[PDB]
Amino acid sequence: MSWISPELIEILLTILKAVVILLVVVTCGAFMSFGERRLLGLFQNRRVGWGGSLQLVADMIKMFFKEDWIPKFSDRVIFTLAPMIAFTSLLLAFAIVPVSPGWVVADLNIGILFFLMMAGLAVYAVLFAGWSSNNKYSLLGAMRASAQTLSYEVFLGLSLMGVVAQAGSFNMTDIVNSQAHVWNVIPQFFGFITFAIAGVAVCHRHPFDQPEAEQELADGYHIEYSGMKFGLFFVGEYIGIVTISALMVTLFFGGWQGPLLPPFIWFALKTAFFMMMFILIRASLPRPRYDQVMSFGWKICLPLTLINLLVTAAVILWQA
Amino acid sequence: MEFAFYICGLIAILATLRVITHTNPVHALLYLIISLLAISGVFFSLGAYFAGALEIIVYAGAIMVLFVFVVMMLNLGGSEIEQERQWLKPQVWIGPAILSAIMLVVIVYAILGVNDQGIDGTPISAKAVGITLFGPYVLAVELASMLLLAGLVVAFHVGREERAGEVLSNRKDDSA
Amino acid sequence: MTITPQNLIALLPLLIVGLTVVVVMLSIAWRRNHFLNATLSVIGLNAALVSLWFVGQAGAMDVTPLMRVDGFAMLYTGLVLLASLATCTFAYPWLEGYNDNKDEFYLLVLIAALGGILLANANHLASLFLGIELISLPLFGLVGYAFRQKRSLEASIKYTILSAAASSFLLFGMALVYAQSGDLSFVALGKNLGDGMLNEPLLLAGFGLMIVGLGFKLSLVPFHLWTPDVYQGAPAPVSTFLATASKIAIFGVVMRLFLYAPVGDSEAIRVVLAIIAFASIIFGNLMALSQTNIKRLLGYSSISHLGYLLVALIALQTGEMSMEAVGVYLAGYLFSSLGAFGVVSLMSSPYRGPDADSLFSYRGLFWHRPILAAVMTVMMLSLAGIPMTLGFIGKFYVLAVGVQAHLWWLVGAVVVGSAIGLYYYLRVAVSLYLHAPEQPGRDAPSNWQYSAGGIVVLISALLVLVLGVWPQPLISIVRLAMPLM
Amino acid sequence: STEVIAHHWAFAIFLIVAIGLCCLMLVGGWFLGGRARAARLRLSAKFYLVAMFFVIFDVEALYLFAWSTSIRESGWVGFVEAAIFIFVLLAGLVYLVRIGALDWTP
Amino acid sequence: MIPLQHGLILAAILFVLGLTGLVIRRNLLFMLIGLEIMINASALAFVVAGSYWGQTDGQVMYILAISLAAAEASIGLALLLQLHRRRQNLNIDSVSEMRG
Ligand SMILES: CCCCCCCCCCCCCCCCCC(=O)OC[C@H](COP(=O)(O)OCCN)OC(=O)CCCCCCCCCCCCCCCCC
Numbered sequence A: 001m002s003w004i005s006p007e008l009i010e011i012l013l014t015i016l017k018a019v020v021i022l023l024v025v026v027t028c029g030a031f032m033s034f035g036e037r038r039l040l041g042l043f044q045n046r047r048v049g050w051g052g053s054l055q056l057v058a059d060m061i062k063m064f065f066k067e068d069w070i071p072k073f074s075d076r077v078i079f080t081l082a083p084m085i086a087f088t089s090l091l092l093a094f095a096i097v098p099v100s101p102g103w104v105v106a107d108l109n110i111g112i113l114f115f116l117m118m119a120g121l122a123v124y125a126v127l128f129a130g131w132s133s134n135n136k137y138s139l140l141g142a143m144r145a146s147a148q149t150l151s152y153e154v155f156l157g158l159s160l161m162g163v164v165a166q167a168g169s170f171n172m173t174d175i176v177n178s179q180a181h182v183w184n185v186i187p188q189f190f191g192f193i194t195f196a197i198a199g200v201a202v203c204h205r206h207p208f209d210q211p212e213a214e215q216e217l218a219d220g221y222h223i224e225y226s227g228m229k230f231g232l233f234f235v236g237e238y239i240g241i242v243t244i245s246a247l248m249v250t251l252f253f254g255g256w257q258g259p260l261l262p263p264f265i266w267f268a269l270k271t272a273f274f275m276m277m278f279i280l281i282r283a284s285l286p287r288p289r290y291d292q293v294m295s296f297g298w299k300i301c302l303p304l305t306l307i308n309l310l311v312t313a314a315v316i317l318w319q320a
Numbered sequence B: 001m002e003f004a005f006y007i008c009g010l011i012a013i014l015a016t017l018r019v020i021t022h023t024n025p026v027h028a029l030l031y032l033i034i035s036l037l038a039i040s041g042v043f044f045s046l047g048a049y050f051a052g053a054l055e056i057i058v059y060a061g062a063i064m065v066l067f068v069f070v071v072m073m074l075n076l077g078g079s080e081i082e083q084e085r086q087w088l089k090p091q092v093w094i095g096p097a098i099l100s101a102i103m104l105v106v107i108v109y110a111i112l113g114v115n116d117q118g119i120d121g122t123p124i125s126a127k128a129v130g131i132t133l134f135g136p137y138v139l140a141v142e143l144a145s146m147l148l149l150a151g152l153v154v155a156f157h158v159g160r161e162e163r164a165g166e167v168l169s170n171r172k173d174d175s176a
Numbered sequence C: 001m002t003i004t005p006q007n008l009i010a011l012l013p014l015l016i017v018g019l020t021v022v023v024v025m026l027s028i029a030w031r032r033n034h035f036l037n038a039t040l041s042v043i044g045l046n047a048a049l050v051s052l053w054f055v056g057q058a059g060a061m062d063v064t065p066l067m068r069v070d071g072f073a074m075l076y077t078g079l080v081l082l083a084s085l086a087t088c089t090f091a092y093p094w095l096e097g098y099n100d101n102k103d104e105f106y107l108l109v110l111i112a113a114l115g116g117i118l119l120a121n122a123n124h125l126a127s128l129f130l131g132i133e134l135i136s137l138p139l140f141g142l143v144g145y146a147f148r149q150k151r152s153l154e155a156s157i158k159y160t161i162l163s164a165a166a167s168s169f170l171l172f173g174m175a176l177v178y179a180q181s182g183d184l185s186f187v188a189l190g191k192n193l194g195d196g197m198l199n200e201p202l203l204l205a206g207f208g209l210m211i212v213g214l215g216f217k218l219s220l221v222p223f224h225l226w227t228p229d230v231y232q233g234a235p236a237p238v239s240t241f242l243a244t245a246s247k248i249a250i251f252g253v254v255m256r257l258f259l260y261a262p263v264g265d266s267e268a269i270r271v272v273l274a275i276i277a278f279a280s281i282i283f284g285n286l287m288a289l290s291q292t293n294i295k296r297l298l299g300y301s302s303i304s305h306l307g308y309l310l311v312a313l314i315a316l317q318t319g320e321m322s323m324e325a326v327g328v329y330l331a332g333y334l335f336s337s338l339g340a341f342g343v344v345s346l347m348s349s350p351y352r353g354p355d356a357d358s359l360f361s362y363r364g365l366f367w368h369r370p371i372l373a374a375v376m377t378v379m380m381l382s383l384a385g386i387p388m389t390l391g392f393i394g395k396f397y398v399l400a401v402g403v404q405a406h407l408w409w410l411v412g413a414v415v416v417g418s419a420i421g422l423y424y425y426l427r428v429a430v431s432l433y434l435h436a437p438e439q440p441g442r443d444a445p446s447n448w449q450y451s452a453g454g455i456v457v458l459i460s461a462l463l464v465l466v467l468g469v470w471p472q473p474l475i476s477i478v479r480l481a482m483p484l485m
Numbered sequence D: 001s002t003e004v005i006a007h008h009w010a011f012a013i014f015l016i017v018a019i020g021l022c023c024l025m026l027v028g029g030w031f032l033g034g035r036a037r038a039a040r041l042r043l044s045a046k047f048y049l050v051a052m053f054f055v056i057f058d059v060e061a062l063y064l065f066a067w068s069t070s071i072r073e074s075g076w077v078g079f080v081e082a083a084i085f086i087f088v089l090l091a092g093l094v095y096l097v098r099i100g101a102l103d104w105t106p
Numbered sequence E: 001m002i003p004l005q006h007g008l009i010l011a012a013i014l015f016v017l018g019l020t021g022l023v024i025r026r027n028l029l030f031m032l033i034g035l036e037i038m039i040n041a042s043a044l045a046f047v048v049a050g051s052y053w054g055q056t057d058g059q060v061m062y063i064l065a066i067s068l069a070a071a072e073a074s075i076g077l078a079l080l081l082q083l084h085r086r087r088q089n090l091n092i093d094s095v096s097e098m099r100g
């Protein structure tokens, strides 16, 4: 304790809390993968451990001790980097999510802009996977999925511009403190709907999964991936859903602001509701055609986001 | 701040050199993205938080995506040009390199003779930039929309396909 | 500054052309209609020309830190609008034979015109940078509108790559100027330097890198190797705009910059500009002496004409006739160029693939198209600078400004360059009245739209001759159009 | 303040641990476990156009992001200016949809 | 604090490297890639200058620069597509029919 200083422990406790958040997020994403699979089975009216909870652990052991394989005629660097980007994109974006007063990895001024930076880089995982795979059909599927993403990544930020407008800041804590009275789910309702649609599309979750369904010359950008590298994409998707869910709580549901339960409990409670809301959506939603998803993103969501921001501005300036 | 400026500044120069001398097009683009992330760190180190984010959101998350799309669409790479590796031949790069070196020397000389109180690094926010964009520089934002509209119209006119179908065969003069 | 109701009147030309770009685009959205969309474009461009009256009544004023509206701005706005209405009148007959999207051509001509109006009112480095890109990016598509033609694609790729390289040199130069100045306004470039300290290495280096970009756009040696290839490949309707609107718009902003910027009176920049002018005047005429392609010949010609104009810029901080000379010269260059390039357009319309660019195509024009041959003769004499043509009055101004500024090497170059020029200009002129029994010439279209293009080249020739004998009317107008100093 | 310094270190550690965790899992997959001893075609420019449209609209959204964080400071004048910008963006979007440049199915 | 001169030299190195790339490469793609390095380097210089003077103008100019880069790369890659579709060749030396 000789070297220990009141300031050092502050710069040590903070690092510890950041590592705790990182671990809890990765755990939550992995657990949800199992929790979902089981719930989906219950909906379809159909174990390794406690209620199958150890199935997640079993899969990890199998994937770790599975022969790792990079196609002989595949760019090793690009092939290996794709899964890495998928796992360490939205995970890094969680650094801006304030889970409770006194618990935020990074209180950045750019705030929400950091999520957009990471969401923008996530597209390369799909593109790199397709090109490196060396499977002509994988390339077509990757390109279809990438075009679908860009069709939803276009209004992703604009969907959150009404919230930023009301808060007058990109900082997430400022955005939460600005929902003290009314959560942005009510005033920025169209923003919430559009952001949810774009968020699931960015995470490549239902119904934006399987973008290669119509094309018989398309297979998927995960066909050549096996073992942990295959798992990194799967886990990355669920970690991304957790990150999106935690962003919706922070942006449209007042974050950790709740009437009685402890602040952190509220954050978790709401985040869990969103994580399971996506689960209800997966089961109760017919996948639309690739043409429909492309058109809906450019002809409906993009115009709506542009209009919501203009109307929000008018109301704000009028009330002032 | 100082470490960030020099380390990111160096990561950028090294990556940029790998880009201009690379044979694989996608690898060259990867090193270009790496250099853009490095320049974003330089921007953040100088207090340009807005420019910092845009460097990753628009340059390394949009303009570069478009480049990769084209390389993957036309299956670029392995062409006789990238097989001959002519750029590596000394008689091909020595002349260009000398012109560039002399240009750098003359430019650096002018820079070394400028007043330098140093860059503090006080963060300039996106709010401040927005007040300037929709205040003194209003005509710029309105005319910038027309510039991007021109890019959209021209890129569509010359970039549109006359043959329908997600997969097309490379025919001379794109005969249909 | 902010946008007051008064400031909004001074923006009428920019606002009207901008609204036209939107309404025409919404018309194309509703239904592609070559006639309506072309008509809407011409109506908007004319409305902007008429609005110049209201702008003048309002008076000179600085709308924002980026734009200053004065007589100079009105004059160059008028020049770009006239050269742009002509481009549209010359495009309809040509686009009639283009079996593809043709409404976008007018949409791009409108956005390029917006760039020239901005460059006319530009009083800030941001406005200079944005105006050039607003007049260049649309032109990339216009130069490559017939992408199916090999020459048009080659011309578009060459212009785009070289213009992009030129835009980086310009931006980097402006950045170095900012690093030393701290203000991006023209009046502040060299203001912080003390007496005898104007030649600050970085300020000069910034201007030098900016000159690479500006010199490219003005086809000035040693950044001119692109002119003949792009002028020949670009569709004839487009070549008219590239030869007139872009050059006049960019030369004007350069004049305002070297006039307002304190660093403008640097001897180092003046001596460097002088070498460029001398080379441009001599090299342009010498390279056009053996050209058998009219488009390439007019390309090399532009190199020399812009070199003649640079002499007035070099004599700017020594007299007041410098600004008047450029106005009168550019007015003559506009009519002379619209005449020559317009005749080429009419002889290349409707679009049937390659344009009539070989001089052999014009070896008996009089015996088929009498009025077109007469116009070409008048324009060839005007571009040669022969007394009785407006082109001569422009050359007289340049020589007068040079003599008053003791630019003896440059005045000597104008004489030698003009002598070399007479050889190729006269050759093209006399060729029109020779007999070419071979008649592969295509028949002329018979619609009022094609006849309108013939009226444009005819009126331009009449103006070149009337103002060549009586120039006081034009001299009086240009003298009213003076920058707000 | 030690708070900003602590948050700086925490952010760095989070980023290093996150990327380190991914590498650990990947290198573990490679080491843990045994192993067996052992041109003519192109994609339509419709893929490029979507990406190109994304780039144009994404760069246009940059201006609206800067306005969003400063709507009150810019005032109604700023609203009128942004309204014109959004209108031009929508007008171009209408053009793209009406010319059929935004329909994946022919 | 970072010396303004150090920031300007970083931009100059990236600018000259980008130019070298545009001249030594015959592939149109590597030429377009080289131009992106050059325009990014010019935008970096504006940010460095604006930071030295503590003005938002540097970032405002950067935004105008990246807007041109987005539009120029869009049109640039469109012409590359047209060249590939018709000539199945990206050697810019072959695009040299007009001369003299
Ligand atoms: C009556 C209403 C209905 C009709 C509307 C008009 C119809 C025609 C519209 C098209 C032409 C418009 C040209 C307008 C020129 C006159 C502008 C004007 O107001 O002139 C005076 C003006 C100064 O006005 P002010 O500031 O009020 O004076 C205060 C004095 N104490 O001083 C100036 O600003 C100088 C103006 C002259 C120089 C610029 C000319 C620009 C237009 C021409 C461009 C092309 C030039 C070459 C033409 C060659 C022709 C052979």
Ligand SMILES: [Cl-]
Binding pocket: C369, C370, C371, C372
């Ligand atoms: Cl006739």
